[PDB]
Structure formats: structure tokens, C-alpha cells
């Protein structure tokens, strides 16, 4: 019958993909060692002191 040329227009109503919150990086020990450049194999050898017995 009657044929009309109409555009196909795109909208955006605020329906975004659901993603979780990020909480882990704040709870973990970050950067106690920084001088990996200037060490062999990018390795820092943390020393744990000694204990003895009587």
C-alpha cells in the first residue's frame, strides 16, 4: 500500500553492560620492592632473619 521512506534511528537510554566492582587491588600489599631494575633476573632476595634454640 502506502510506502514511506523512514530513517532507522539509534537511541541510547542508559542500558549498559553489567560489570563488577573492583575491590581486590586495595587489600593486597603493593610495591614493597621497587628496584627490580638494577638486580639480576629482576629479582630482589628478601632476607628473613635467623632464630636459635637453647
Amino acid at each position: 500500500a502506502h510506502i514511506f521512506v523512514k530513517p532507522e534511528l539509534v537511541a541510547e537510554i542508559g542500558v549498559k553492560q553489567l560489570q563488577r566492582e573492583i575491590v581486590l587491588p586495595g587489600l593486597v600489599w603493593t610495591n614493597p620492592l621497587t628496584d627490580f631494575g638494577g638486580s639480576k633476573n629482576d629479582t630482589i632476595t628478601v632476607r628473613v632473619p635467623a632464630i636459635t634454640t637453647a
Binding site: 542508559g14 553492560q17 560489570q19 563488577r20
Partner: protein, 327 residues
């Protein structure tokens, strides 16, 4: 992506950015028409607004409510959370957990319960015993009103099924409305409102039937917002469990062979489940029971009529037996 330091394969895997989309369409046309003879309009109709227009507007409003209810109840839910009437709170905590696990935002969540679910909340010993819930000024006992549980407020509705509750984020369901325009050839009609929806009213006299025809209509459309993979996670469905069904009235005697009796079946929660049970008669010759609850006993004798209702939780259908003595 990830890779190793000092790795002699200095390649990078490019990431991709794909946008998705869905579509919202107008689909339905909700109307309410009437027709009046000239005699009725002259004599019988005394107040047109009170007798004709207001009932028509109310009918369209209730039709729109039922439209929204069919949208909410008919949405694709992968699974239903079964509310144990003795222990109701774990079901709602589970619903909140399912919404959280899908990363649905915690605000703009509406929980709409049926009458049976609200009554089960009130009857629950968790809210009723004033030591399992604090709340010394007991409200589930002195008012039969729970109100809030598991972090969500309760909205009591009679449009949805009594034994079912829905917890949905605001973005789950979309309604769209459109008021039809009064054309050039039409008599200049009015425009009314039903629950904030603008309805078009129109009147046309037909010489052939010597009468007047009225129409009060609107264009409607609805959508369930699903995710990119096709799942539905923004709304959660709960259904009240049923463990046994009973036929009200017990054993009964028919008035006569030509007589009929309309059976009603109620689960232990008290919901009217007669629209969901299958009816059978042990003695088909003596009595026959319709699939919709009607019982007709053609021959004198006794018949054992069984109502079988598959419960919401599945499994073997609950069977209720009644005895009919046809005279």
C-alpha cells in the same frame, strides 16, 4: 592480555570493540468500544459521564494494568526461586544474591508480591515470634504486615498471581505509549487519561443501526531488556511452594443426575489452584468431571474424583481425592 617480560616474541594481540543493540517496537492497540441505540441514549442513559465514560476509562486502565502484569509475569526467567512457607527469608536472600551475582545495581529495585506470598510472610515464624525478629511491638502478629525483609520493601499487588513475587531493577521492563490522533474526517473527540496514559476518545453515529458507537483507545508496546548473550538477569522470580492440595467442601452428594457442581482446589498455602489441576473420575459411567472443575454425574452410584496438581517445585503431582454420591 598478558605476556612475559624479555619474551623474544614481541607480538601484541589487538583487542576488539563491538557495540551491541536491541529494539523497542509498538505492537498492541488497547481499546474499549461501546454502542448505544437512540432509544437507550434518549431514555435509559441519564448521566453520560457517570454511566459511560468513567467505566470505559476504568476498563482501559485495568486492561493496561493487566498488560503490564503480563509483561512482568511472562518475562523469560531461567529459574524460579521456591519460597518455603515455613522458611521464607532464605528465598529472598537468594534472590538478592542472584541479582548481585549478575552485577545488577542495588538501587531502583522493586519487589512486588502476591497476596499469598504476603500472607506467608506474615504467617512465618521468623517474623511472627518477636524473638526471631526482634520487633517487640509485633507487626506480623498484631497487624499481619511484614513490610521489609532481606533488604527490599514489599509492594502488595492483586494483578500478579497470589503465590508469586518479582524483584526487578528499573531497567528490566520498558513500556511505551502513543495516543492515536483524531483524523480529519472524525467528529472532534476528547482525550482522557488512564493512570497517566493519554487515551483517544471518538464517537461515530451509524445510520444503519440508528445508534452511536464510542471508542477509547491507545497504542502500547512493551519490552524485556535482556543482555548481550540473551540471558535475563535484571529481574528475578519467586514462587511459593505447595506441598498438598485439598478439594474444598469434602465429600459431597449431587442434587440429581442432571446436576452439576463446580469444584475448587486449594493448596496448603490457600491459593486457588483450580485453574492448574487435572480432574479425573474413577467411575466414568456414574460421574464425569470436566477439565475446568465442573462435575456431572449422569448415573446413580458413587465416583471417586481426583484432582492432580503438579507443584511449583516439580516432582510427583499432588493428588486430592473426593467421593461423589450421585442419586
Amino acid at each position: 592480555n598478558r605476556r612475559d617480560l624479555r619474551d623474544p616474541d614481541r607480538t601484541v594481540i589487538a583487542s576488539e570493540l563491538v557495540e551491541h543493540s536491541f529494539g523497542v517496537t509498538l505492537d498492541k492497540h488497547v481499546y474499549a468500544a461501546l454502542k448505544f441505540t437512540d432509544e437507550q441514549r434518549t431514555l435509559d442513559i441519564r448521566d453520560y459521564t457517570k454511566q459511560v465514560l468513567m467505566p470505559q476509562v476504568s476498563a482501559v486502565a485495568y486492561e493496561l494494568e493487566d498488560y503490564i502484569a503480563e509483561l512482568i509475569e511472562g518475562a523469560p526467567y531461567e529459574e524460579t526461586i521456591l519460597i518455603d512457607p515455613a522458611d521464607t527469608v532464605p528465598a529472598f536472600i537468594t534472590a538478592d544474591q542472584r541479582m548481585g551475582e549478575a552485577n545488577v545495581p542495588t538501587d531502583s529495585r522493586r519487589l512486588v508480591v502476591g497476596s499469598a506470598v504476603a500472607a506467608a510472610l506474615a504467617k512465618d515464624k521468623q517474623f511472627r515470634h518477636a524473638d526471631w525478629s526482634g520487633d517487640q511491638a509485633n507487626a506480623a502478629l498484631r497487624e499481619a504486615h511484614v513490610g521489609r525483609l532481606a533488604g527490599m520493601n514489599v509492594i502488595r499487588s492483586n494483578a500478579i498471581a497470589p503465590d508469586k513475587a518479582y524483584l526487578w531493577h528499573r531497567t528490566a521492563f520498558i513500556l511505551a505509549y502513543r495516543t492515536p490522533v483524531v483524523p480529519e474526517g472524525a467528529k472532534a473527540g476528547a482525550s482522557f487519561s488512564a493512570n497517566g496514559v493519554a487515551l483517544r476518545w471518538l464517537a461515530d453515529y451509524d445510520y444503519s443501526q440508528l445508534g452511536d458507537r464510542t471508542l477509547l483507545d491507545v497504542f502500547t508496546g512493551r519490552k524485556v531488556v535482556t543482555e548481550v548473550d540473551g540471558s535475563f538477569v535484571r529481574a528475578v522470580e519467586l514462587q511459593l511452594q505447595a506441598s498438598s492440595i485439598t478439594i474444598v467442601g469434602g465429600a459431597f452428594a449431587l442434587a440429581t443426575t442432571t446436576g452439576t457442581k463446580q469444584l475448587k482446589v486449594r493448596d496448603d498455602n490457600g491459593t486457588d489452584v483450580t485453574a492448574r489441576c487435572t480432574f479425573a473420575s474413577s467411575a466414568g459411567t456414574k460421574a464425569t468431571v470436566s477439565a475446568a472443575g465442573l462435575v456431572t454425574g449422569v448415573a446413580a452410584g458413587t465416583a471417586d474424583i481426583t484432582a492432580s496438581y503438579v507443584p511449583p517445585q516439580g516432582g510427583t503431582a499432588k493428588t486430592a481425592t473426593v467421593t461423589v454420591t450421585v442419586p
